Amino acid sequence: EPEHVQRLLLSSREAKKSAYCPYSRFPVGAALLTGDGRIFSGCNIENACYPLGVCAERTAIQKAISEGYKDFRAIAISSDLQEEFISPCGACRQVMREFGTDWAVYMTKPDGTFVVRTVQELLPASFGPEDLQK
Amino acid sequence: VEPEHVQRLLLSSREAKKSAYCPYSRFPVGAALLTGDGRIFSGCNIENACYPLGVCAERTAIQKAISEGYKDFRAIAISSDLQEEFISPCGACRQVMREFGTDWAVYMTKPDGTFVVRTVQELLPASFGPEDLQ
Amino acid sequence: EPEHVQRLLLSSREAKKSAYCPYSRFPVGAALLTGDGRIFSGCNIENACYPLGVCAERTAIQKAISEGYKDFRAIAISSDLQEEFISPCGACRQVMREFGTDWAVYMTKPDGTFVVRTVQELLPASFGPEDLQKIQ
Amino acid sequence: EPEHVQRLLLSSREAKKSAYCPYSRFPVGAALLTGDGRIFSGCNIENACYPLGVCAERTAIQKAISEGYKDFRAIAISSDLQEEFISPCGACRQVMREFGTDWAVYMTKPDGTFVVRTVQELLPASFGPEDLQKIQ
Numbered sequence: 343e344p345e346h347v348q349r350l351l352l353s354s355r356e357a358k359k360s361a362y363c364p365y366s367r368f369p370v371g372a373a374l375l376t377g378d379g380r381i382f383s384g385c386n387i388e389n390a391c392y393p394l395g396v397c398a399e400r401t402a403i404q405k406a407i408s409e410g411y412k413d414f415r416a417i418a419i420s421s422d423l424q425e426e427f428i429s430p431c432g433a434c435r436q437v438m439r440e441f442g443t444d445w446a447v448y449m450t451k452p453d454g455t456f457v458v459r460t461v462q463e464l465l466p467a468s469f470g471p472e473d474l475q476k
Numbered sequence: 477v478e479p480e481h482v483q484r485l486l487l488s489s490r491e492a493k494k495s496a497y498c499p500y501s502r503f504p505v506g507a508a509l510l511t512g513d514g515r516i517f518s519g520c521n522i523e524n525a526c527y528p529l530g531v532c533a534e535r536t537a538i539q540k541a542i543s544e545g546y547k548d549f550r551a552i553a554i555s556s557d558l559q560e561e562f563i564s565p566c567g568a569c570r571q572v573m574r575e576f577g578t579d580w581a582v583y584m585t586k587p588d589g590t591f592v593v594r595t596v597q598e599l600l601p602a603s604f605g606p607e608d609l610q
Numbered sequence: 611e612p613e614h615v616q617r618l619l620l621s622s623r624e625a626k627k628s629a630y631c632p633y634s635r636f637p638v639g640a641a642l643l644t645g646d647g648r649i650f651s652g653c654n655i656e657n658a659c660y661p662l663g664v665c666a667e668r669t670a671i672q673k674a675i676s677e678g679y680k681d682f683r684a685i686a687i688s689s690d691l692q693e694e695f696i697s698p699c700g701a702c703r704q705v706m707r708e709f710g711t712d713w714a715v716y717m718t719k720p721d722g723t724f725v726v727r728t729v730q731e732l733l734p735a736s737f738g739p740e741d742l743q744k745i746q
Numbered sequence: 747e748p749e750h751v752q753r754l755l756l757s758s759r760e761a762k763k764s765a766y767c768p769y770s771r772f773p774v775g776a777a778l779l780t781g782d783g784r785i786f787s788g789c790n791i792e793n794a795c796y797p798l799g800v801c802a803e804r805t806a807i808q809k810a811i812s813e814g815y816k817d818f819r820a821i822a823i824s825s826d827l828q829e830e831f832i833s834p835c836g837a838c839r840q841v842m843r844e845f846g847t848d849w850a851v852y853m854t855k856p857d858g859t860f861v862v863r864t865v866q867e868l869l870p871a872s873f874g875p876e877d878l879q880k881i882q
């Protein structure tokens with residue numbers, strides 16, 4: 343829905359302002375839209391020990407889940423990288439996939455252009471909960 | 477930390493634990509942190525079918541706080557369903573805590589409300605940190 | 611099958627025996643084939659704190675890199691799932707991609723059947739070194 | 747220094763040469779001594795996505811486990827930092843603890859000086875395997 347898309351894209355851009363990224367100096371914002379229209383946002387949060395950082399998409403998803411929301415319709419991602427749409431890393435894709443494959447990922451540039459792909463399209467033939475079921 | 481803030485933290489952590497996404501371990505964890513200005517942020521563990529892609533309660537709480545512009549932390553309380561052990565932060569959580577200072581308090585609780593309190597410094601002595609990269 | 615595929619399949623199946631997986635009871639093996647024909651094995655190694663585990667594919671890659679090998683041709687993955695091909699998680703795909711998009715992932719079943727996809731296919735529109743302007 | 751200490755320190759220093767760290771430009775080496783005398787080396791291996799990196803200590807431990815070794819006597823860590831002994835991060839401490847608390851961590855400087863602490867001392871009142879035991 344055009345109302346929700348625009349709010350989501352702006353929320354992702356705004357979330358970027360809170361990024362804690364003194365090591366990469368590469369800020370990332372994300373915003374997730376739930377089934378009932380609520381938006382949760384997040385940013386990357388780095389650690390002196392690089393592996394202990396977290397991505398924007400996961401900050402947003404983790405916030406939503408902690409507040410009792412597991413039904414996601416879309417997630418938008420923003421960065422300062424001008425030359426390419428910001429794409430989720432594989433770890434973020436796997437966390438997205440834990441909560442379904444059919445939902446939309448908006449990969450943006452600072453100028454407001456974007457491309458959309460589903461979680462399924464971004465993580466084909468995925469490992470998932472089904473592997474551990476039965 | 478005032479007994480009133482401690483009680484608020486204990487209740488917040490236990491309440492947050494109810495939202496835990498942990499179908500793999502069936503080991504729910506909640507956490508609540510207190511900022512300098514008295515705001516409380518809570519979190520829970522959020523697991524993934526690929527075990528390494530989960531996140532701990534403490535980090536969900538810290539990441540939520542940072543995403544909303546708070547990096548000044550006074551205390552964090554942790555809750556679990558383990559009756560016989562105080563719930564202790566894993567080393568990754570200790571390292572994320574340490575990114576935001578060593579002097580603050582960690583309340584490791586039991587379900588009955590008894591707890592052990594230690595500083596981040598005490599839990600992670602001679603720590604790796606931002607100074608290693610200066 | 612070609613000799614190198616036979617090698618990948620056997621080494622990956624063997625690697626699974628070393629899995630440290632008391633929590634999931636889901637053992638995974640991986641075998642990584644380098645450009646010069648050397649195979650590096652790996653397995654999942656879990657931790658009481660679930661997020662601190664590592665996957666088989668990353669164990670294998672990390673072993674190869676630590677020994678000075680960065681030219682990877684193929685990696686095979688093995689599990690105990692008889693009725694599913696074992697697929698790499700997104701984190702493993704991202705680590706694979708750090709070392710290139712143009713190499714093969716063999717997703718196997720215990721009966722020795724498999725599906726092959728490239729890293730590029732498994733991680734379309736990949737985040738990577740270009741995002742940090744490291745390709746210069 | 748005892749012969750096994752000399753070996754640990756030299757192997758850890760040598761392991762640093764293999765570091766894949768184009769993002770931090772902060773190379774780390776580790777050397778893990780098993781009960782039977784075998785040394786496993788490791789180095790940090792970074793990723794364009796910073797969280798997908800791995801530390802030297804875990805590279806070494808994961809290699810050892812993958813080859814069937816779980817009895818660890820000591821681990822030494824090396825870096826290019828002259829001003830500070832290189833200390834393991836909390837994640838590495840937690841992985842060390844999965845395999846016991848009574849063993850030794852040598853935190854070194856490039857000049858060969860070091861401080862030694864046990865895993866227990868570096869990770870007091872630790873979360874561990876017992877937290878997840880079925881019967882309590």
Ligand SMILES: O=C1N[C@H](O)CCN1[C@@H]1O[C@H](CO)[C@@H](O)[C@H]1O
Nearest residue numbers: 370386397398430431794795796
């Ligand atoms: O937030 C992100 N989302 C994408 O999925 C990948 C990249 N990032 C973050 O960008 C910085 C550089 O890797 C890191 O801080 C990293 O976590």
Ligand SMILES: O=C1N[C@H](O)CCN1[C@@H]1O[C@H](CO)[C@@H](O)[C@H]1O
Nearest residue numbers: 505521532533565566658659660
């Ligand atoms: O939230 C946690 N806090 C402590 O730091 C460690 C343990 N956990 C969580 O407990 C489950 C079992 O490892 C996992 O889901 C794990 O993330």
Ligand SMILES: O=C1N[C@H](O)CCN1[C@@H]1O[C@H](CO)[C@@H](O)[C@H]1O
Nearest residue numbers: 525526527638654665666698699
């Ligand atoms: O080794 C793996 N490779 C694939 O990328 C994903 C699955 N795994 C491992 O399987 C167990 C369950 O998630 C875990 O121990 C997990 O790390």
Ligand SMILES: O=C1N[C@H](O)CCN1[C@@H]1O[C@H](CO)[C@@H](O)[C@H]1O
Nearest residue numbers: 390391392774790801802834835
């Ligand atoms: O290997 C390490 N051992 C210590 O436990 C912590 C630091 N590191 C590594 O140093 C770089 C900067 O955080 C990173 O590549 C990081 O993984």
Ligand SMILES: [Zn+2]
Nearest residue numbers: 397430431434
């Ligand atoms: Zn990511």
Ligand SMILES: [Zn+2]
Nearest residue numbers: 532565566569
């Ligand atoms: Zn933890």
Ligand SMILES: [Zn+2]
Nearest residue numbers: 665698699702
């Ligand atoms: Zn994996």
Ligand SMILES: [Zn+2]
Nearest residue numbers: 801834835838
């Ligand atoms: Zn480490």
